Design an enzyme around this catalytic site. Structure first.
Site, PDB file in Angstrom:
ATOM      1  N   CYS A  66      -2.097   1.081  -2.711  1.00 18.19           N
ATOM      2  CA  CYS A  66      -0.573   1.255  -2.360  1.00 18.19           C
ATOM      3  C   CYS A  66      -0.441   1.842  -0.759  1.00 18.19           C
ATOM      4  O   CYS A  66       0.557   1.038  -0.213  1.00 18.19           O
ATOM      5  CB  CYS A  66       0.337   2.409  -3.114  1.00 18.19           C
ATOM      6  SG  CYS A  66      -0.766   3.944  -3.053  1.00 18.19           S
ATOM      7  N   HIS A 142       2.029   8.403  -4.725  1.00 16.72           N
ATOM      8  CA  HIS A 142       2.204   7.126  -4.766  1.00 16.72           C
ATOM      9  C   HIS A 142       2.817   6.755  -3.051  1.00 16.72           C
ATOM     10  O   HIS A 142       3.181   7.926  -2.545  1.00 16.72           O
ATOM     11  CB  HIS A 142       3.418   6.610  -5.541  1.00 16.72           C
ATOM     12  CG  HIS A 142       3.668   5.359  -5.534  1.00 16.72           C
ATOM     13  ND1 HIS A 142       2.720   4.326  -5.523  1.00 16.72           N
ATOM     14  CD2 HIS A 142       4.816   4.529  -5.748  1.00 16.72           C
ATOM     15  CE1 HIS A 142       3.414   2.967  -5.547  1.00 16.72           C
ATOM     16  NE2 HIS A 142       4.587   3.198  -5.638  1.00 16.72           N
TER      17      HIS A 142
END
Lengths: 210, 17, 214, 76
Positions: A66, A142
């Site tokens: 990510c 994230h």
């Protein structure tokens, strides 16, 4: 599966430069988002903002990658900051020439370009100020990115299958992204779910001059 | 003073996937 | 048992407030930008309380008992947690001291005693509920909009809603490096979180008023 | 000429107007795209409240000027 990248401006800057980000630009720490003084120290214009918490778009295909996709989103929507001839710049123009995916990269051409970036830079995924977990393990954290493209404001998440998310129009009184109410508000809403939960796991980086 | 209203004086250095 | 919903008008709030006991040196003002340098220069400081109007989607608190009266309770939340700004011997000042002497409800005003003082304040100011720039609906009608308030009391930050049955909501500790309430990240973040739900639904129905000097 | 109207929630509204346009015309225009009645609107430019019968030129509002919209709503 890769080692989850640390929210470190030096590591983001290192990856970015290797991909093609011009040397006159770099990532930096954002510690306060609505505070005067602390904004005189941050380089402007801020061209992308990366957020760590609990219009070219790229679908995420590699576990724990990510952070790299966040750099790809920040850079790909800021092509004018890329070195003509660099690796990302070539990749971007290639797909434009052939007109593969004008802005939604989920191909063969893109998963290879990325695995190639991933394998040519494995060592940097482990650098920083903390200890490297095992790429096999989950993180609960994230990375997502905010950019201003064509006067539109978007939130880019490699895991959001629906693609990029439009947040609405920009405010031209804004020298940059830090001065965009739509970003501050959307970020602020994530923090509020964190203020209720006693989670302090939040980091932000801005892409601005060096 | 955190960002919300592995340390570096406060700014966190966390890892995300 | 039903009042006309009050307008998010600095003048109307200021009107009510002064009749309750707010000193003349203070007033409510429009807050149109909440993370804006320049705009916050046309804004009086210190900002002692912030009232927010939005769609329903260690401090003094009052349970709301009258329909559409949320705006008056917001004013009562703002003033009662800033006693220092009240006129000695004003209606609200008398009300607050009366309960502290008798130690009725040190901070949770849910009594039939609180209801009578509110019902009389309402009976003596009925036309005020109707003033403003916009046209008055009928007390009987629902609004979908609700008022709530923020204040810093004894080092903490609270959100006060007369309809939150659980009472006042603690948001966390103040930051002593805060010139006032506008410089409290806990408030900006809590507020910004409501706007985010608005932005998603495409609703612009939001207003804020600050209680500051002048 | 183009102008922007900024809301409290961060939304920016773009409008095409003439210097001869009155504040009321600007409000009617806000109403056309946002559906918000003008009685419920107050506009601000450079810290000043804009009065309904004045035009954009009276206030020297130029191309690209930004205005702020404060709403006068009723809540219970």
């Amino acid at each position: 599966a890769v080692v989850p990248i640390e929210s470190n401006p030096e590591v983001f800057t290192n990856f970015a430069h290797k991909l093609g980000l011009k040397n006159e630009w770099a990532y930096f720490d954002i510690y306060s988002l609505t505070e005067p003084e602390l904004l005189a120290f941050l380089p402007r214009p801020v061209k992308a903002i990366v957020l760590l918490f609990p219009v070219i778009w790229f679908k995420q295909s590699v576990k724990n990658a990510c952070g790299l996709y966040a750099i790809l989103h920040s850079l790909s929507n800021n092509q004018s900051l890329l070195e003509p001839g660099s690796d990302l710049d070539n990749f971007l123009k290639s797909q434009s020439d052939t007109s593969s995916s004008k802005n939604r990269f989920d191909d063969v051409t893109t998963d290879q370009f990325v695995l190639n970036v991933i394998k040519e830079n494995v060592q940097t995924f482990s650098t920083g100020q903390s200890e490297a977990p095992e790429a096999t393990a989950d993180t609960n954290l994230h990375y997502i990115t905010y950019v201003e493209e064509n006067g539109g404001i978007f939130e880019l998440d490699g895991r959001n299958l629906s693609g990029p998310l439009y947040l609405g129009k920009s405010d031209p009184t804004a020298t940059d992204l830090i001065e965009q109410e739509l970003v501050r508000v959307r970020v602020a809403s994530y923090m509020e779910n964190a203020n209720e939960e006693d989670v302090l796991n939040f980091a932000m980086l801005g892409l601005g001059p060096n | 003073k955190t960002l919300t209203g592995q340390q570096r004086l406060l700014v966190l250095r966390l890892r995300g996937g």
